[PDB]
Amino acid sequence: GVLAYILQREIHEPECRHLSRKFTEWAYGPVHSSLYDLSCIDTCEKNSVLEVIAYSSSETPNRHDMLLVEPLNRLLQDKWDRFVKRIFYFNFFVYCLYMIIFTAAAYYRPVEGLPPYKLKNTVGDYFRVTGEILSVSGGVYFFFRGIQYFLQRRPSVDSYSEILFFVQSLFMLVSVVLYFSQRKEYVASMVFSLAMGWTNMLYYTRGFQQMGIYAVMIEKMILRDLCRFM
Amino acid sequence: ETVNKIAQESKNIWKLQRAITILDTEKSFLKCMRKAXXXXXXXXXXX
Amino acid sequence: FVYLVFLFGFSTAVVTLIEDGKYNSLYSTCLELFKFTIGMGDLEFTENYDFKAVFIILLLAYVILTYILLLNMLIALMG
Amino acid sequence: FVYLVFLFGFSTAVVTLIEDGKYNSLYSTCLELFKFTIGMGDLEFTENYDFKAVFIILLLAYVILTYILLLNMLIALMG
Amino acid sequence: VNASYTDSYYKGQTALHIAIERRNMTLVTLLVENGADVQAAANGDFFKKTKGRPGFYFGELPLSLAACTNQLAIVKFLLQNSWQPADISARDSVGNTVLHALVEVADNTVDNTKFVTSMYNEILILGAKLHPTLKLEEITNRKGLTPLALAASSGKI
Amino acid sequence: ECRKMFGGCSVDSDCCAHLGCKPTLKYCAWD
Amino acid sequence: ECRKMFGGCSVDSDCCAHLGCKPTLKYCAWD
């Protein structure tokens, strides 16, 4: 309530303008318009009102804070309706191909023998080899992205999904080291990696009200109820 | 119950999580040129 | 859509892991896996299985989770 | 009444599709199908089956839907 | 007195629109007497459904406004004045008359129904008093809808 | 008849002898 | 190859003949 008050506590009196967060001025017999400052978007180097709202978790009073408007609700729509929605789908689609490739090499991997030597000759030995390199390369990006997340915020469930991504990418890395080691057992680790990535992929659906609800419910079953029963 | 609670929240839950998704991307998108005025078209009477 | 993703991913994971018998095909393996999701299955036959200890664990992961969270989660939605 | 309609129609569809073994009769086939609805079944035996790929799909359709919507829908009604 | 806004937002808004928006008889009166066009359509995005922009639609014409904002006296003065009586059957950009707009402005709350319902009544009483030949409730909006049929198309029960 | 090797049993198979219909492709494979 | 006695079949077994992989240890036991 106070958050909303501080951002939107518009003031009108002499010297009012410097203090006020919101100015609204556009009314038709029906109708009204509200204008918001807005500082929270402006805060950056500090975590900020917007940053805190974006980041904040496990408090349990959050539904309300996220809901706050105009800017928090208003700001998000402006950010995403204009461009963000397009950006996410491209990310999701790009991820999906990585998955098809990781499975395809794994699906079509040669029994051998273990690991090398690999002929890498012809289309048959050429297509699979590209996939294997591509999948490992795909693996590195998650590991690099994850480290920053650990690196940016060393201190301390949530976030549940980012955490899973790090686990899978590492699993692939373990397989790769094994592959260089060339032990047969290394597969099993890769097999965990292929399936885990696919289960991870379902996450990208998030931000969709039908879809977003399902992922959240699944996350809830596994953090709490399954974990407790197990 | 977890499913039911999630359902009651989920217009709202769907809303908060999205914002988080947008924020992380914005932070990692290179802080590339992007918007950086808010107002909401309104019409309730109240008249 | 969700079950299809979980099922598809799991099937792909199985197909790579051990061709074995009847798991060689994705169309058959998916059918084998769907049967598991419906809750009718024959469990831990193993025989002719590589990473079966690795594999039994994989089956426990997939089957348990699928019966446990997707079916109940969809069913919870249904009431 | 509803299960009887779904079951009866499905049984008729099966009876035409492949007499096979034990599916030749409607009284037996219905018994075979009811067993599936109760949730006890043996799946994708196939053997001596025509349009089995066509048929496995039919079984997936009927069994899945029946377990999935009628039983849950009746059961949802029950609470 | 008849110059209008040209930006996409307030497009076509005149001083008379504003006087009404502000519920100001005195200024409505004054503008009409110095010859404000009573049929001027305020049609910019500020006068249609929220982007959200928003908001807010009544559509367009002074009479329509004056009704949709529940302002009976001004509805009367628009239709009855010496200077320019409102055309009670005019259609906005969407084909809507004041009866159509009223249906659009309903939101199924008890006090909403109540005010729309009798302002509707009032318009008809004025139609029949002033211009008896006009079968008002038969007039179709762009999409072919009588006010009734719109009401029912949009669950304004 | 019998759908020899590369013979598709969606219907009418009746896959030959050494062949067996595998319920994905619906073709007949043996060996 | 075949994981003779005391051979662990987590992967690549392929447990020998007289041996059988028992799904706990993953080693190969026979007799």
XYZ file of C-alpha atoms in Angstrom, chain E:
157
model
C -15.612 27.817 -31.368
C -15.515 24.724 -33.629
C -11.799 24.012 -33.982
C -10.845 20.409 -33.182
C -7.830 18.429 -31.938
C -5.790 16.717 -34.662
C -3.377 14.447 -32.757
C -4.309 10.735 -32.786
C -5.233 10.967 -29.114
C -7.894 13.699 -28.737
C -8.698 13.909 -32.492
C -11.892 15.779 -33.278
C -12.428 17.063 -29.754
C -13.983 20.556 -29.626
C -14.528 22.950 -26.724
C -18.157 21.717 -26.447
C -16.908 18.186 -25.825
C -14.825 19.448 -22.920
C -17.688 21.496 -21.361
C -19.753 18.359 -21.224
C -16.909 16.194 -20.037
C -16.690 18.690 -17.199
C -20.460 18.597 -16.513
C -20.683 22.366 -16.954
C -24.134 23.548 -18.058
C -23.087 27.170 -18.103
C -20.263 26.482 -20.544
C -22.336 24.101 -22.662
C -24.992 26.831 -22.790
C -22.420 29.485 -23.687
C -20.743 27.446 -26.442
C -24.042 26.441 -28.088
C -25.120 30.133 -28.101
C -21.928 31.249 -29.790
C -22.562 28.469 -32.274
C -20.717 25.316 -31.201
C -21.423 22.461 -33.639
C -23.554 20.062 -31.726
C -22.842 17.151 -34.113
C -19.004 17.336 -33.885
C -17.515 13.854 -33.447
C -14.672 13.439 -30.964
C -13.144 10.301 -32.521
C -9.507 10.075 -31.400
C -8.093 7.132 -29.419
C -9.005 8.965 -26.197
C -12.676 8.427 -27.155
C -12.505 4.697 -27.988
C -11.739 1.536 -25.942
C -8.482 1.501 -23.956
C -5.266 0.172 -25.497
C -5.195 0.352 -22.577
C -4.650 4.012 -23.389
C -7.250 4.266 -22.432
C -10.321 5.063 -22.705
C -13.197 5.983 -22.723
C -15.879 5.548 -25.364
C -19.313 7.174 -25.425
C -18.945 7.399 -28.807
C -18.085 10.610 -30.272
C -21.077 12.964 -30.385
C -22.109 15.499 -27.664
C -25.560 13.978 -27.120
C -24.002 10.505 -26.847
C -21.479 11.822 -24.365
C -24.108 13.678 -22.359
C -26.169 10.511 -22.044
C -23.363 8.014 -21.415
C -22.187 10.190 -18.543
C -25.704 10.314 -17.137
C -26.311 13.977 -17.668
C -29.999 14.340 -18.400
C -30.386 18.142 -18.296
C -27.710 18.568 -20.949
C -29.207 15.778 -23.029
C -32.388 17.848 -22.913
C -30.659 21.165 -23.653
C -28.866 19.572 -26.587
C -32.080 18.302 -28.190
C -34.316 21.217 -27.164
C -32.171 24.428 -27.521
C -32.968 27.320 -29.888
C -29.514 27.470 -31.443
C -28.899 24.000 -32.784
C -31.017 21.051 -31.730
C -29.077 17.780 -31.671
C -29.869 15.212 -34.380
C -31.233 12.493 -32.088
C -30.573 9.743 -34.641
C -27.004 10.537 -35.699
C -24.572 7.606 -35.898
C -20.917 7.637 -34.674
C -17.979 6.218 -36.660
C -19.051 2.689 -35.660
C -22.720 3.228 -36.629
C -23.817 3.655 -33.069
C -26.529 6.009 -31.994
C -27.035 7.227 -28.447
C -29.067 4.109 -27.812
C -26.227 1.971 -29.172
C -23.631 3.884 -27.076
C -25.732 3.450 -23.902
C -25.794 -0.341 -24.494
C -22.021 -0.160 -24.917
C -21.610 1.755 -21.692
C -23.503 -0.841 -19.594
C -21.378 -3.060 -17.344
C -24.043 -5.273 -15.664
C -23.790 -3.698 -12.217
C -27.086 -2.832 -10.544
C -26.571 0.956 -10.423
C -25.251 0.806 -14.026
C -28.331 -0.870 -15.417
C -30.478 1.534 -13.413
C -28.934 4.703 -14.902
C -28.570 3.401 -18.493
C -32.028 1.943 -18.394
C -33.815 5.223 -17.643
C -31.568 7.461 -19.650
C -32.560 5.107 -22.465
C -36.217 5.620 -21.463
C -35.612 9.348 -21.420
C -34.189 9.382 -24.928
C -37.167 7.519 -26.285
C -39.641 9.836 -24.502
C -37.790 12.739 -26.127
C -37.720 11.065 -29.515
C -41.489 10.544 -29.438
C -42.156 14.045 -28.076
C -39.895 15.931 -30.494
C -39.782 13.716 -33.606
C -42.589 11.102 -33.542
C -42.008 9.597 -37.003
C -38.566 8.231 -36.044
C -38.402 4.533 -35.252
C -35.300 4.847 -33.075
C -34.923 1.303 -31.842
C -34.803 -0.069 -35.359
C -31.606 1.829 -36.389
C -28.661 -0.535 -37.111
C -24.995 0.148 -36.184
C -22.288 -0.564 -38.772
C -22.371 -4.300 -37.993
C -26.121 -4.518 -38.696
C -27.181 -4.434 -35.044
C -30.175 -2.722 -33.519
C -29.477 -1.508 -29.929
C -31.272 -4.590 -28.606
C -29.245 -6.923 -30.802
C -25.995 -5.281 -29.689
C -27.056 -5.611 -26.048
C -27.486 -9.353 -26.633
C -24.329 -9.731 -28.716
C -22.323 -8.245 -25.798
C -24.046 -9.909 -22.781
C -25.534 -6.672 -21.448
C -28.349 -8.600 -19.877
